[PDB]
Amino acid sequence: RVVVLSFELLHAPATVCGPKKSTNLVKNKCVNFNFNGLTGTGVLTESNKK
Amino acid sequence: VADYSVLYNSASFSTFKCYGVSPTKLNDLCFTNVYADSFVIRGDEVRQI
Amino acid sequence: VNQNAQALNTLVKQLSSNFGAISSVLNDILSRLDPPEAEVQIDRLITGR
Secondary structure (H helix, E strand, O other): OEEEEEEEOOOOOOOOOOOOOOOOOOOOOEEEEEEOOEEEEEEOOOOOOO | OOOOOOOOOOOOOOOOOOOOOOOOHHHHOOOOEEEEEEEOOOOOOOOOO | OHHHHHHHHHHHHHHHOOOOOOOOOHHHHHOOOOHHHHHHHHHHHHHHO
16 A cells, blocks of 8 residues: 655645744844744844735 | 654554655645545556656 | 846846756755755755856
8 A cells, every 4th residue: 555645835824833832932133933834034023014 | 744643654664665754854844735645556566656 | 227236136036046946945945855865956056056
């Protein structure tokens, strides 16, 4: 019996990642962020963008 | 993430031929859709996959 | 000034092209492949950039 998993990478959100969940937000600082499967490094600030 | 609790990927079965990373390492990779396809083949058809 | 703006603009937009790789962002390749299969594709991407 052969079981293969076909994967497609899209923009839909993923709600479950790893054993750790919250990792409480820290703003106005340079941090490594992973949000909705998007991994990057940058400063997290508030803006007025709607 | 599919399931991190039950992992048989380590030396639990007869034959393991894997590419990339094992199911243990899939916990850090986020993908959208998962289609699990189940089918039965013969002995000589394993090399054709 | 338009040639300088267009030169910086072309210089940034070429970063988004994959140049024969899976994706232009290194996090998608590093978050999937192991370092040994990954070194051929990252070296092709760096050589293109």
